[PDB]
Amino acid sequence: KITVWTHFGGPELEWLKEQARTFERTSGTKVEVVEVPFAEIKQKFILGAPQGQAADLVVTVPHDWVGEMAQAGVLEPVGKYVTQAYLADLQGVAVEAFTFGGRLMGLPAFAESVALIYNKKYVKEPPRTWEEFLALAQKLTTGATFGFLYNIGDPYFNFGFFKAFGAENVFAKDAKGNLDPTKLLIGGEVGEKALQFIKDLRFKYNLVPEGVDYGVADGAFKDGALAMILNGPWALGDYKKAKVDFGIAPFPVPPGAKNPWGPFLGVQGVVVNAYSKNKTQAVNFAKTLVTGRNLVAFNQAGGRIPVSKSAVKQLEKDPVVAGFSKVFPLGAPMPNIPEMGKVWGPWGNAISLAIQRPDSNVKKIVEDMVAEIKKAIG
Numbered sequence: 001k002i003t004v005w006t007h008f009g010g011p012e013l014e015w016l017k018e019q020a021r022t023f024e025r026t027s028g029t030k031v032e033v034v035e036v037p038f039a040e041i042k043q044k045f046i047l048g049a050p051q052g053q054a055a056d057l058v059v060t061v062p063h064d065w066v067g068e069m070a071q072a073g074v075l076e077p078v079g080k081y082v083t084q085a086y087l088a089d090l091q092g093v094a095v096e097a098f099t100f101g102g103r104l105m106g107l108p109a110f111a112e113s114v115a116l117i118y119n120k121k122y123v124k125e126p127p128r129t130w131e132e133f134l135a136l137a138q139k140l141t142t143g144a145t146f147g148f149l150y151n152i153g154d155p156y157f158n159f160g161f162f163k164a165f166g167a168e169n170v171f172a173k174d175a176k177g178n179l180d181p182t183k184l185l186i187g188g189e190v191g192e193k194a195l196q197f198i199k200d201l202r203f204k205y206n207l208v209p210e211g212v213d214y215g216v217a218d219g220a221f222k223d224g225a226l227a228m229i230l231n232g233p234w235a236l237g238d239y240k241k242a243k244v245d246f247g248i249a250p251f252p253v254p255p256g257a258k259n260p261w262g263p264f265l266g267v268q269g270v271v272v273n274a275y276s277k278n279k280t281q282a283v284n285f286a287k288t289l290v291t292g293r294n295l296v297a298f299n300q301a302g303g304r305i306p307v308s309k310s311a312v313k314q315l316e317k318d319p320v321v322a323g324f325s326k327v328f329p330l331g332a333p334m335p336n337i338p339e340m341g342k343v344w345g346p347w348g349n350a351i352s353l354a355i356q357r358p359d360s361n362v363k364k365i366v367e368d369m370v371a372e373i374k375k376a377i378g
């Protein structure tokens with residue numbers, strides 16, 4: 001028996017359960033699928049793995065976790081178990097996302113980003129500009145209906161606004177090619193302007209009130225009470241299941257931003273526990289999940305985009321794939337370095353402080369954020 005930790009729900013989870021059943025018949029090895037909230041998995045795995053207390057595999061982890069997990073020694077290197085043919089068919093950025101210390105540390109499976117997802121019952125065609133979006137979102141907001149909602153306190157969801165206002169990524173690239181964790185790009189003027197726009201989404205434009213977290217916004221879109229959400233393809237399974245007719249579009253560039261809006265690109269991949277007492281079967285099962293056919297099936301059940309070149313071309317005309325193909329080129333991959341784990345907390349703390357009150361000193365909040373991150377890295 002091998003165990004799988006997953007953050008999947010809905011149709012995505014049902015796919016994973018089916019593949020687990022199928023592997024028990026084309027294997028004889030029992031697969032237990034264990035649900036774990038996304039925000040709890042990394043700590044559970046890093047701390048539990050070396051104690052014999054973590055699952056045999058995680059389907060899936062985001063690539064920003066790779067450096068920290070690899071340094072904790074908890075990831076099985078997977079390059080020795082895979083062919084060049086398999087590797088050649090993978091998109092370069094997906095390979096790079098799961099490469100650390102010059103080694104492939106998981107099997108890259110799906111690509112994702114946030115985007116403007118609009119319910120076509122309220123919005124027939126995507127707003128062409130910020131001003132058109134703003135006017136629409138305010139119009140469609142009333143007593144029980146919302147024009148626009150999103151996980152406003154979340155640093156990942158807000159990165160696109162940080163990019164618009166001038167952050168290429170989280171960290172500057174140094175000397176020739178490698179990120180320097182000592183040089184943040186999300187503080188200073190960029191950070192102050194991003195945080196003011198995010199404040200304005202509540203206190204000026206009156207779009208996103210107090211209390212709105214992932215579940216509030218996601219719940220609202222599924223229910224059909226919400227015109228527009230900023231969310232990613234992980235949410236599409238439940239939107240397809242609730243029969244919402246959605247479109248995918250880039251988010252408008254915030255007013256005052258010198259650069260276009262562009263989100264983080266995330267790669268989800270399967271990782272094997274370096275302390276698995278059943279690596280052979282764990283590895284074989286992982287490999288079953290990332291065949292072209294299974295990657296396509298997962299997209300159809302939900303919506304995350306295959307990192308298989310082959311599988312992607314196959315879905316070239318799928319609406320979800322075509323939609324995200326116009327969004328991904330605007331974005332930047334998350335860093336996968338260990339230090340990324342230190343940034344999210346103070347970054348998200350800064351945003352929550354900014355949006356808590358109208359009178360929040362954005363200048364000092366950003367200064368303190370930068371100070372807290374420098375301290376956590378050193």
Ligand SMILES: OC[C@H]1O[C@H](O[C@H]2[C@H](O)[C@@H](O)[C@@H](O[C@H]3[C@H](O)[C@@H](O)[C@@H](O)O[C@@H]3CO)O[C@@H]2CO)[C@H](O)[C@@H](O)[C@@H]1O
Nearest residue numbers: 007008009038062064065154155156157214234266344
């Ligand atoms: O907020 C900081 C956080 O940002 C990044 O996490 C994001 C994920 O990469 C992204 O996939 C998405 O996560 C959703 C799962 O895919 C979905 O299956 C389900 O579990 O809900 C998740 C959202 O609640 O969004 C998160 C951001 O919240 C980054 O990878 C993390 O390391 C970082 O901590």
